[PDB]
Amino acid sequence: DLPPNLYIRNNGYYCYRDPRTGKEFGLGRDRRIAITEAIQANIELFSGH
Protein backbone atom coordinates (compact mmCIF):
# COMPACT_ATOMS: atom_id res chain seq x y z
CA ASP A 1 0.00 0.00 0.00
CA LEU A 2 1.83 3.13 -1.18
CA PRO A 3 0.98 6.42 0.63
CA PRO A 4 -1.65 8.77 -0.93
CA ASN A 5 -0.70 11.55 -3.39
CA LEU A 6 2.50 9.53 -4.04
CA TYR A 7 2.94 7.40 -7.19
CA ILE A 8 5.65 5.35 -8.93
CA ARG A 9 6.96 5.20 -12.53
CA ASN A 10 7.13 1.96 -14.55
CA ASN A 11 10.90 2.32 -14.03
CA GLY A 12 10.36 2.00 -10.25
CA TYR A 13 11.12 5.71 -9.66
CA TYR A 14 9.00 7.23 -6.87
CA CYS A 15 7.40 10.67 -7.40
CA TYR A 16 5.08 12.93 -5.32
CA ARG A 17 2.29 15.08 -6.89
CA ASP A 18 1.95 18.64 -5.55
CA PRO A 19 -1.71 19.91 -5.48
CA ARG A 20 -0.76 23.55 -6.25
CA THR A 21 1.16 22.91 -9.51
CA GLY A 22 -0.30 19.43 -10.08
CA LYS A 23 3.18 18.59 -11.43
CA GLU A 24 5.31 15.70 -10.03
CA PHE A 25 8.57 15.70 -8.01
CA GLY A 26 11.40 13.24 -8.70
CA LEU A 27 12.61 11.72 -5.40
CA GLY A 28 14.48 8.48 -6.20
CA ARG A 29 14.01 4.68 -6.29
CA ASP A 30 14.23 4.50 -2.47
CA ARG A 31 10.70 4.18 -1.05
CA ARG A 32 12.48 5.07 2.22
CA ILE A 33 13.63 8.57 1.28
CA ALA A 34 10.69 9.06 -1.11
CA ILE A 35 7.95 8.13 1.40
CA THR A 36 9.77 10.33 3.93
CA GLU A 37 9.27 13.46 1.80
CA ALA A 38 5.76 12.38 0.79
CA ILE A 39 4.82 12.35 4.50
CA GLN A 40 6.01 15.94 5.00
CA ALA A 41 4.14 16.88 1.82
CA ASN A 42 1.06 15.11 3.22
CA ILE A 43 1.16 17.30 6.35
CA GLU A 44 1.01 20.40 4.11
CA LEU A 45 -2.14 19.03 2.41
CA PHE A 46 -3.75 19.71 5.83
CA SER A 47 -2.16 23.16 6.42
CA GLY A 48 -2.53 24.37 2.82
CA HIS A 49 0.07 26.48 0.98
We report the CATH number of the domain holding residue 49 as 3.30.160.60
Nearest to 37 by CA among 46, 8, 28: 28
Q: Summarize the chain as % helix, strand, coil (round to 5).
A: 35, 25, 40
- Reduce the DSSP state of residue 8 to 3 states and report it: strand
Strands 14-17 and 6-8, by their bridges, are antiparallel
- 12: Cβ contacts below 8 Å, ≥ 6 apart: 29
Number of domains in the chain: 1
Question: In terms of residue numbers, what domain contains 21?
Answer: 1-49
Q: How large is the C-alpha radius of gyration of the chain?
A: 10
User: Quick one: DSSP state of residue 2?
Assistant: P
Spatial distance between the Cα atoms of 20 and 28, rounded to a whole number of angstroms: 21
CA angle 25, 49, 17 (to 5 degrees): 25
